[PDB]
Amino acid sequence: NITEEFYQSTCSAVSKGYLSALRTGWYTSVITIELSKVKLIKQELDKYKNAVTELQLLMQS
Amino acid sequence: NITEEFYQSTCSAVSKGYLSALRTGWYTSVITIELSKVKLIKQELDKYKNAVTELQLLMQS
Amino acid sequence: NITEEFYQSTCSAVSKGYLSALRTGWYTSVITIELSKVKLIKQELDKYKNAVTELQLLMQS
Amino acid sequence: FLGFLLGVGSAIASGVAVCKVLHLEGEVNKIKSNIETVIEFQQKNNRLLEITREFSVNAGVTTPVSTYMLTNSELLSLINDMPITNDQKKLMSNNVQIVRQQSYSIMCIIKEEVLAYVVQLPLYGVIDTPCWKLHTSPLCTTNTKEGSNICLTRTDRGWYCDNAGSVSFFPQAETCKVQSNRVFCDTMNSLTLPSEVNLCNVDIFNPKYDCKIMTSKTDVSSSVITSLGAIVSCYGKTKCTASNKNRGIIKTFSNGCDYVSNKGVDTVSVGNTLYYVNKQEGKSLYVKGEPIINFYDPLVFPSDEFDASISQVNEKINQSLAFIRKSDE
Amino acid sequence: FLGFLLGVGSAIASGVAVCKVLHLEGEVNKIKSNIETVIEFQQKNNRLLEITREFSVNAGVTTPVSTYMLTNSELLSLINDMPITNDQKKLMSNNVQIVRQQSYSIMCIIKEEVLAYVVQLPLYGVIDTPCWKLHTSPLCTTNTKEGSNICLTRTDRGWYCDNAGSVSFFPQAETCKVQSNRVFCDTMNSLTLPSEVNLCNVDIFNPKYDCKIMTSKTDVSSSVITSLGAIVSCYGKTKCTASNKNRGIIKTFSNGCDYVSNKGVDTVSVGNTLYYVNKQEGKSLYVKGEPIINFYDPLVFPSDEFDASISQVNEKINQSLAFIRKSDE
Amino acid sequence: FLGFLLGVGSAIASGVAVCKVLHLEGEVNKIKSNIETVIEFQQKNNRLLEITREFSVNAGVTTPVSTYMLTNSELLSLINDMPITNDQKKLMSNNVQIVRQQSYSIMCIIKEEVLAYVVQLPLYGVIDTPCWKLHTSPLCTTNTKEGSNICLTRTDRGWYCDNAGSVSFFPQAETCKVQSNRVFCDTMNSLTLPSEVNLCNVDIFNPKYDCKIMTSKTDVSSSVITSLGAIVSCYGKTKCTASNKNRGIIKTFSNGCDYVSNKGVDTVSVGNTLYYVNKQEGKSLYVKGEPIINFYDPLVFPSDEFDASISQVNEKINQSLAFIRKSDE
């Protein structure tokens, strides 16, 4: 049930009928990832190393 | 043919020679998607279900 | 060694101890790309043509 | 307008704080085949590459949180173990894409044996309280003389929500997200106001709250699309109309500030700008009343008050008036 | 500067309006192997996953419209069936990435049997009309005394385009996109002005149009890179130079507001900031004239007018002048 | 606040300039199987599709530069051949994701036989010079009377860095990126100031530099999260507290502007807004002193100076004071 009122005297309008959902706080959780046809496995294991490497680069100094 | 003029008296410059392409309206069209080695088909059909599921979640209440 | 001072008299605070890394210039380099189970090669060669085509469209007029 | 009154915060200060703790306990303990197999590995590794991709282009802090960072299943699990209201849980489950937009993913440590990142989820401590959106537009005179026109604009536009005996005011309504009749907002982009701030809507000259306005002599035309209609501020020689999709132009606005509801109206044109009105269902009420801009004398009206108020503009007039009255004598 | 004068609209109000109609007729009718096979399915499904991916991280409304949402072929088909000029069609075909940037994709319904979303394409009703971009920079005095300097800045900078007997003015030139000599803009981010607004460029003290300026005493240095050169506002003790890439510094600016064209100039340095000038080809004209800031007496100059105009600043001076003249007597 | 004082530049003017040269020499010379094989092609082509994907949704100009545009290996190679300091090289290698964020990729030519795009990398000519971040918050009176309160706010907040005998000032601290104690900034978003600008911190009424402030009568409450603590501007009836995570509320602020360090403080609440303080390690110093807002008489205080300064506000008071003193006689 959304309604609206216009005020000619002040050139403004109010839309009512809304319900709030305001972020007031934070919930922090910690996510962990466990790290360590045959040819197909090879290119995927290489992809893995670029990902670990790339992550190692952003976590530098 | 783009030209430019500088006005020392008011510290401003005008660049002329451009042609307009202003969005003035909208054209709305409706796009529809029709919904419903063997192992390879399985993981793809599962991908399909996450997509339908994910779309079902955003269209919630 | 980061420190901070608060000034009650002017409602302001200074955080010191930082080291600069300001972009002052640009280094421009030019990157070039050289252009030209069997069924698998076919869908990849088609992907190639959409990429060349798509790039040809953005470089239009 | 009043977005510059907002405070300044550190958005990931909580997650980064958690991240710093995981480093500490790191040092604290630092003291004395099959095709189904090929498929599962590509599925699992794909996700790692996507997580890595997002972190690498966002310098280790991502928002919104992708399904790669946190799948719908993992997210729902989190939601279930949060100490929150079942309505808070239910709210988050039906709006998971919004929760996602309000979450951060912060890269933390990668010890060669374990990869860890902190996920910062929003918790909504205020739910189902009434909200209202205030729309404002410049109010100028309908004078025939070209220059020397006076204008007035309420600057207190934005979302207002009941919150803990006060009102959370969102000056940048853009910070709020609307799903049907639900308003998703971040309190970090808000001011906390007394409930008396609402008096500016009914009586702009009221003594309990000092209603905010800005003044100018720029009588330029524009429109504000509201929830259920459109405000049209038409001044000078601007062509301002309201149209229906099948029928065509159904209303022509005169000089001044007017309004049309979206019921039976599809678009609004002000000058060269075409606006589509919102098509949401709901009732509109037109409250007649004299434009308060007519109560002012253009000769003593302070026409460049960027951040003033009704009483503040008025008191500035009295000072100018006092300068005159005590002169002739 | 004058972006705050712009109206407020609902960008997807038209597509959402269409979306709401598809729900209605939903209820209205609601009344009484081979490897080539594996490849085609992954190709088709990939697209579904990408569409789903975009919708899920953008809460169901995406912009720009990806090739996943709408392939180049589907888009061109749409363009061909729009009731538009062949030059409007041709415009869109040669700039499909821009059309894409100006389009929205809005998620609508997913009934278990059919998935539907609305694509909102831009239609360009104004093409090949002359546009001009106005660049402005602070104009201050060249006074030897440290404090007490007066400044003036035209605030009416941005794109101007002929449009329907008037001028569409884009205060935030950032809202415009430039491809060679073509300017892509959205009328939603514009004001509609009389063609007399151009008089401010030739005669800033003209009576037909009240040219907009802001005043201050902050005589800080900066530069504005134009289309074919660079404006340099150099004040105080700032080092301001113009350089060539092979030759080095080829011009040193004195205190005041000056300009150099990009022909033979590669960069401009003002203080610690290095600016690369635009290298586009075209002719530049230097129009000599006394800085109007010199015509003002720093003692009665209103030095904090955020949104004023030439005549408005002048009339404010007369009021201050009248206070004096009628005093000694 | 003072972001509007910044100059205007063309961000890719240098790369576009290079791009235009590759067209010229184009016309200048224009004058008289195995599975390992399948895998390598998909790997190489994937990259082409991703590069094409990025260019097509960004209209040919991308930022940040992805690993698809330029792999970590290619980037490091570039860094090694730049004519720069080994510390500049080392800086870039340890912060490759930031370098990436400060780079542009600009689509250039696609002749049917060769695809070429220009990569614009940042070069950091200023390294390891001291930087400081200035935080400011509104300073208002602690008066019992409701309306008629006076306020003052330093508007010169942002990052300051030593640079070539001057100070590079970043009005929008948001343009700066912080990694531990390292501040990554772009000089394009800065002003060049005399080193005397720092005098505003120790003596705001000093004659050598005219310290910048804004005045108002809007005594609204807010907080500014600093590097090592939190500033709380608490006025009116606002509830302002500082809390610890395990212990709870550990400090209640009175009306006025105060500060708490982050050592042992986890959060700060001002009104309905909860702020998490930054948890970085470092020492904080509280410098006691009378709020200068108390030195002013609310009756002659210019309460709507958007861009003024200490001496400028003061001189405006003297003019108002002179009007009075020479009247009674």
Side-chain angles (χ1 to χ4, degrees):
Chain A
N1 279 261
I2 294 177
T3 59
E4 185 169 285
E5 299 181 18
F6 171 74
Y7 308 101
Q8 183 184 18
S9 61
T10 62
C11 190
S12 59
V14 174
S15 309
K16 304 181 180 67
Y18 296 89
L19 298 176
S20 65
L22 314 180
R23 188 205 63 78
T24 58
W26 290 111
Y27 187 83
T28 61
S29 58
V30 175
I31 309 302
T32 62
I33 294 181
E34 55 293 321
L35 302 175
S36 67
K37 291 178 179 184
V38 173
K39 187 58 180 181
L40 294 177
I41 284 292
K42 282 282 198 305
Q43 68 189 34
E44 190 67 31
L45 213 64
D46 283 327
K47 292 181 170 181
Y48 175 86
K49 291 181 295 185
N50 286 359
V52 173
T53 295
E54 168 67 19
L55 288 176
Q56 279 172 338
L57 297 183
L58 158 76
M59 305 296 335
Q60 71 321 295
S61 88
Chain B
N1 279 261
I2 294 177
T3 59
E4 185 169 285
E5 299 181 18
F6 171 74
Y7 308 101
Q8 183 184 18
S9 61
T10 62
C11 190
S12 59
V14 174
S15 309
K16 304 181 180 67
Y18 296 89
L19 298 176
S20 65
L22 314 180
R23 188 205 63 78
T24 58
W26 290 111
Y27 187 83
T28 61
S29 58
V30 175
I31 309 302
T32 62
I33 294 181
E34 55 293 321
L35 302 175
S36 67
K37 291 178 179 184
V38 173
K39 187 58 180 181
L40 294 177
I41 284 292
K42 282 282 198 305
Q43 68 189 34
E44 190 67 31
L45 213 64
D46 283 327
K47 292 181 170 181
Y48 175 86
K49 291 181 295 185
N50 286 359
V52 173
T53 295
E54 168 67 19
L55 288 176
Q56 279 172 338
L57 297 183
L58 158 76
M59 305 296 335
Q60 71 321 295
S61 88
Chain C
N1 279 261
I2 294 177
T3 59
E4 185 169 285
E5 299 181 18
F6 171 74
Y7 308 101
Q8 183 184 18
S9 61
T10 62
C11 190
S12 59
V14 174
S15 309
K16 304 181 180 67
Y18 296 89
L19 298 176
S20 65
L22 314 180
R23 188 205 63 78
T24 58
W26 290 111
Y27 187 83
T28 61
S29 58
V30 175
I31 309 302
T32 62
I33 294 181
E34 55 293 321
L35 302 175
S36 67
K37 291 178 179 184
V38 173
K39 187 58 180 181
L40 294 177
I41 284 292
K42 282 282 198 305
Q43 68 189 34
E44 190 67 31
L45 213 64
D46 283 327
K47 292 181 170 181
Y48 175 86
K49 291 181 295 185
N50 286 359
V52 173
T53 295
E54 168 67 19
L55 288 176
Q56 279 172 338
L57 297 183
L58 158 76
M59 305 296 335
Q60 71 321 295
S61 88
Chain D
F1 300 101
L2 300 173
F4 65 87
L5 294 178
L6 293 176
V8 176
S10 188
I12 56 172
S14 58
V16 166
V18 171
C19 186
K20 279 186 167 57
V21 172
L22 293 181
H23 281 73
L24 190 130
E25 296 169 359
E27 284 196 44
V28 160
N29 305 348
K30 260 188 170 303
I31 314 293
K32 288 179 178 179
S33 304
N34 294 322
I35 190 58
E36 292 161 9
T37 298
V38 184
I39 292 183
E40 283 173 280
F41 183 39
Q42 291 176 348
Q43 296 296 292
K44 298 284 292 184
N45 193 35
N46 178 70
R47 184 176 180 179
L48 174 66
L49 301 183
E50 290 293 339
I51 292 177
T52 303
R53 206 210 50 102
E54 301 183 329
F55 274 150
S56 63
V57 295
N58 290 282
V61 176
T62 67
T63 179
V65 173
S66 69
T67 50
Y68 290 131
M69 293 289 175
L70 203 63
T71 70
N72 294 312
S73 169
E74 294 157 3
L75 180 56
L76 291 169
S77 295
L78 275 185
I79 294 174
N80 217 84
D81 286 353
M82 291 179 183
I84 48 177
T85 309
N86 288 345
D87 285 28
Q88 287 187 37
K89 291 181 180 179
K90 187 167 176 61
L91 176 67
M92 297 179 70
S93 301
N94 293 28
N95 300 279
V96 147
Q97 283 72 5
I98 298 297
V99 172
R100 256 177 211 287
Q101 284 179 323
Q102 296 184 314
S103 304
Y104 290 89
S105 179
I106 311 159
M107 172 59 192
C108 258
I109 57 177
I110 174 169
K111 73 197 217 189
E112 300 164 4
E113 177 160 2
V114 170
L115 166 64
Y117 52 97
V118 181
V119 168
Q120 193 178 285
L121 298 189
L123 68 96
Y124 305 102
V126 180
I127 292 180
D128 293 331
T129 65
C131 288
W132 300 348
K133 184 177 181 179
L134 173 62
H135 312 77
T136 70
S137 198
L139 177 64
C140 310
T141 56
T142 60
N143 299 329
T144 57
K145 293 297 176 202
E146 180 177 4
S148 60
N149 288 315
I150 276 324
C151 295
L152 177 153
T153 311
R154 295 185 60 191
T155 53
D156 53 344
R157 57 170 172 205
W159 277 105
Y160 289 77
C161 295
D162 281 333
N163 185 2
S166 296
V167 172
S168 290
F169 164 58
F170 306 84
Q172 308 150 316
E174 322 86 69
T175 70
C176 296
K177 301 172 177 56
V178 183
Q179 187 289 324
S180 66
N181 68 333
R182 177 85 58 181
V183 188
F184 289 87
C185 291
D186 193 316
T187 55
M188 183 60 61
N189 304 327
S190 72
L191 297 174
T192 302
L193 304 180
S195 57
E196 282 79 8
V197 66
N198 182 81
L199 292 177
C200 293
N201 297 323
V202 184
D203 188 7
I204 200 80
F205 290 110
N206 77 93
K208 298 184 179 182
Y209 192 93
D210 191 24
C211 306
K212 302 195 113 295
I213 61 167
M214 74 167 283
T215 67
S216 66
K217 284 189 150 192
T218 308
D219 51 343
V220 127
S221 287
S222 62
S223 180
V224 174
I225 298 302
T226 63
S227 298
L228 298 178
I231 303 180
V232 172
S233 297
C234 200
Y235 307 111
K237 301 178 177 301
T238 307
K239 178 180 181 104
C240 311
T241 61
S243 292
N244 179 288
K245 69 167 88 68
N246 300 308
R247 291 330 144 125
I249 294 178
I250 56 104
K251 182 174 177 65
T252 300
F253 300 96
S254 304
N255 279 358
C257 179
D258 210 345
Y259 170 92
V260 72
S261 79
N262 64 347
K263 180 182 179 181
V265 178
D266 289 312
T267 58
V268 161
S269 290
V270 177
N272 299 327
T273 305
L274 177 83
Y275 304 81
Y276 284 89
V277 88
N278 283 324
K279 279 279 130 175
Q280 197 174 29
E281 55 280 339
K283 286 191 290 184
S284 300
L285 180 62
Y286 196 112
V287 185
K288 292 198 186 173
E290 188 70 8
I292 65 172
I293 197 63
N294 294 334
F295 297 151
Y296 295 96
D297 193 340
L299 295 181
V300 293
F301 184 79
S303 59
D304 201 9
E305 305 288 304
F306 104 101
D307 177 31
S309 64
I310 288 298
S311 61
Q312 183 170 348
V313 166
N314 280 338
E315 77 177 343
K316 203 149 181 172
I317 294 176
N318 285 12
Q319 290 179 340
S320 301
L321 223 47
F323 288 163
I324 302 172
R325 186 190 46 75
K326 287 223 176 186
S327 68
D328 293 40
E329 315 162 358
Chain E
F1 300 101
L2 300 173
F4 65 87
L5 294 178
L6 293 176
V8 176
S10 188
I12 56 172
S14 58
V16 166
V18 171
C19 186
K20 279 186 167 57
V21 172
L22 293 181
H23 281 73
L24 190 130
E25 296 169 359
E27 284 196 44
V28 160
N29 305 348
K30 260 188 170 303
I31 314 293
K32 288 179 178 179
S33 304
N34 294 322
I35 190 58
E36 292 161 9
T37 298
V38 184
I39 292 183
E40 283 173 280
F41 183 39
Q42 291 176 348
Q43 296 296 292
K44 298 284 292 184
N45 193 35
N46 178 70
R47 184 176 180 179
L48 174 66
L49 301 183
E50 290 293 339
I51 292 177
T52 303
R53 206 210 50 102
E54 301 183 329
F55 274 150
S56 63
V57 295
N58 290 282
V61 176
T62 67
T63 179
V65 173
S66 69
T67 50
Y68 290 131
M69 293 289 175
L70 203 63
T71 70
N72 294 312
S73 169
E74 294 157 3
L75 180 56
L76 291 169
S77 295
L78 275 185
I79 294 174
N80 217 84
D81 286 353
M82 291 179 183
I84 48 177
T85 309
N86 288 345
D87 285 28
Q88 287 187 37
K89 291 181 180 179
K90 187 167 176 61
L91 176 67
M92 297 179 70
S93 301
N94 293 28
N95 300 279
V96 147
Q97 283 72 5
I98 298 297
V99 172
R100 256 177 211 287
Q101 284 179 323
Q102 296 184 314
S103 304
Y104 290 89
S105 179
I106 311 159
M107 172 59 192
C108 258
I109 57 177
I110 174 169
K111 73 197 217 189
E112 300 164 4
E113 177 160 2
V114 170
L115 166 64
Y117 52 97
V118 181
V119 168
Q120 193 178 285
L121 298 189
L123 68 96
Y124 305 102
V126 180
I127 292 180
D128 293 331
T129 65
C131 288
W132 300 348
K133 184 177 181 179
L134 173 62
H135 312 77
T136 70
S137 198
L139 177 64
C140 310
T141 56
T142 60
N143 299 329
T144 57
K145 293 297 176 202
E146 180 177 4
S148 60
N149 288 315
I150 276 324
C151 295
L152 177 153
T153 311
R154 295 185 60 191
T155 53
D156 53 344
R157 57 170 172 205
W159 277 105
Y160 289 77
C161 295
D162 281 333
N163 185 2
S166 296
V167 172
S168 290
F169 164 58
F170 306 84
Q172 308 150 316
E174 322 86 69
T175 70
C176 296
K177 301 172 177 56
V178 183
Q179 187 289 324
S180 66
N181 68 333
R182 177 85 58 181
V183 188
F184 289 87
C185 291
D186 193 316
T187 55
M188 183 60 61
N189 304 327
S190 72
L191 297 174
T192 302
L193 304 180
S195 57
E196 282 79 8
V197 66
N198 182 81
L199 292 177
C200 293
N201 297 323
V202 184
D203 188 7
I204 200 80
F205 290 110
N206 77 93
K208 298 184 179 182
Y209 192 93
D210 191 24
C211 306
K212 302 195 113 295
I213 61 167
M214 74 167 283
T215 67
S216 66
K217 284 189 150 192
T218 308
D219 51 343
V220 127
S221 287
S222 62
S223 180
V224 174
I225 298 302
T226 63
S227 298
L228 298 178
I231 303 180
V232 172
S233 297
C234 200
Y235 307 111
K237 301 178 177 301
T238 307
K239 178 180 181 104
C240 311
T241 61
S243 292
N244 179 288
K245 69 167 88 68
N246 300 308
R247 291 330 144 125
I249 294 178
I250 56 104
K251 182 174 177 65
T252 300
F253 300 96
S254 304
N255 279 358
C257 179
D258 210 345
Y259 170 92
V260 72
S261 79
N262 64 347
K263 180 182 179 181
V265 178
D266 289 312
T267 58
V268 161
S269 290
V270 177
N272 299 327
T273 305
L274 177 83
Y275 304 81
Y276 284 89
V277 88
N278 283 324
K279 279 279 130 175
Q280 197 174 29
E281 55 280 339
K283 286 191 290 184
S284 300
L285 180 62
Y286 196 112
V287 185
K288 292 198 186 173
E290 188 70 8
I292 65 172
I293 197 63
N294 294 334
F295 297 151
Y296 295 96
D297 193 340
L299 295 181
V300 293
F301 184 79
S303 59
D304 201 9
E305 305 288 304
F306 104 101
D307 177 31
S309 64
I310 288 298
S311 61
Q312 183 170 348
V313 166
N314 280 338
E315 77 177 343
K316 203 149 181 172
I317 294 176
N318 285 12
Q319 290 179 340
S320 301
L321 223 47
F323 288 163
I324 302 172
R325 186 190 46 75
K326 287 223 176 186
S327 68
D328 293 40
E329 315 162 358
Chain F
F1 300 101
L2 300 173
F4 65 87
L5 294 178
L6 293 176
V8 176
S10 188
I12 56 172
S14 58
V16 166
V18 171
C19 186
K20 279 186 167 57
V21 172
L22 293 181
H23 281 73
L24 190 130
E25 296 169 359
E27 284 196 44
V28 160
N29 305 348
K30 260 188 170 303
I31 314 293
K32 288 179 178 179
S33 304
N34 294 322
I35 190 58
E36 292 161 9
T37 298
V38 184
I39 292 183
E40 283 173 280
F41 183 39
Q42 291 176 348
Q43 296 296 292
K44 298 284 292 184
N45 193 35
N46 178 70
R47 184 176 180 179
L48 174 66
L49 301 183
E50 290 293 339
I51 292 177
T52 303
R53 206 210 50 102
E54 301 183 329
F55 274 150
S56 63
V57 295
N58 290 282
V61 176
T62 67
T63 179
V65 173
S66 69
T67 50
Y68 290 131
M69 293 289 175
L70 203 63
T71 70
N72 294 312
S73 169
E74 294 157 3
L75 180 56
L76 291 169
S77 295
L78 275 185
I79 294 174
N80 217 84
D81 286 353
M82 291 179 183
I84 48 177
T85 309
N86 288 345
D87 285 28
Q88 287 187 37
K89 291 181 180 179
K90 187 167 176 61
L91 176 67
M92 297 179 70
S93 301
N94 293 28
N95 300 279
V96 147
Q97 283 72 5
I98 298 297
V99 172
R100 256 177 211 287
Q101 284 179 323
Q102 296 184 314
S103 304
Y104 290 89
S105 179
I106 311 159
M107 172 59 192
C108 258
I109 57 177
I110 174 169
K111 73 197 217 189
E112 300 164 4
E113 177 160 2
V114 170
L115 166 64
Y117 52 97
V118 181
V119 168
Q120 193 178 285
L121 298 189
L123 68 96
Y124 305 102
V126 180
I127 292 180
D128 293 331
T129 65
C131 288
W132 300 348
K133 184 177 181 179
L134 173 62
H135 312 77
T136 70
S137 198
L139 177 64
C140 310
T141 56
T142 60
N143 299 329
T144 57
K145 293 297 176 202
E146 180 177 4
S148 60
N149 288 315
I150 276 324
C151 295
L152 177 153
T153 311
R154 295 185 60 191
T155 53
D156 53 344
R157 57 170 172 205
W159 277 105
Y160 289 77
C161 295
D162 281 333
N163 185 2
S166 296
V167 172
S168 290
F169 164 58
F170 306 84
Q172 308 150 316
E174 322 86 69
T175 70
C176 296
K177 301 172 177 56
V178 183
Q179 187 289 324
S180 66
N181 68 333
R182 177 85 58 181
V183 188
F184 289 87
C185 291
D186 193 316
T187 55
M188 183 60 61
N189 304 327
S190 72
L191 297 174
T192 302
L193 304 180
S195 57
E196 282 79 8
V197 66
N198 182 81
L199 292 177
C200 293
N201 297 323
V202 184
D203 188 7
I204 200 80
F205 290 110
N206 77 93
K208 298 184 179 182
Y209 192 93
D210 191 24
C211 306
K212 302 195 113 295
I213 61 167
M214 74 167 283
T215 67
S216 66
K217 284 189 150 192
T218 308
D219 51 343
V220 127
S221 287
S222 62
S223 180
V224 174
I225 298 302
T226 63
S227 298
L228 298 178
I231 303 180
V232 172
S233 297
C234 200
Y235 307 111
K237 301 178 177 301
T238 307
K239 178 180 181 104
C240 311
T241 61
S243 292
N244 179 288
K245 69 167 88 68
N246 300 308
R247 291 330 144 125
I249 294 178
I250 56 104
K251 182 174 177 65
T252 300
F253 300 96
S254 304
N255 279 358
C257 179
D258 210 345
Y259 170 92
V260 72
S261 79
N262 64 347
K263 180 182 179 181
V265 178
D266 289 312
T267 58
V268 161
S269 290
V270 177
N272 299 327
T273 305
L274 177 83
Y275 304 81
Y276 284 89
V277 88
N278 283 324
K279 279 279 130 175
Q280 197 174 29
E281 55 280 339
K283 286 191 290 184
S284 300
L285 180 62
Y286 196 112
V287 185
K288 292 198 186 173
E290 188 70 8
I292 65 172
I293 197 63
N294 294 334
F295 297 151
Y296 295 96
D297 193 340
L299 295 181
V300 293
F301 184 79
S303 59
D304 201 9
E305 305 288 304
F306 104 101
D307 177 31
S309 64
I310 288 298
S311 61
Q312 183 170 348
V313 166
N314 280 338
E315 77 177 343
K316 203 149 181 172
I317 294 176
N318 285 12
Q319 290 179 340
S320 301
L321 223 47
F323 288 163
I324 302 172
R325 186 190 46 75
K326 287 223 176 186
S327 68
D328 293 40
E329 315 162 358

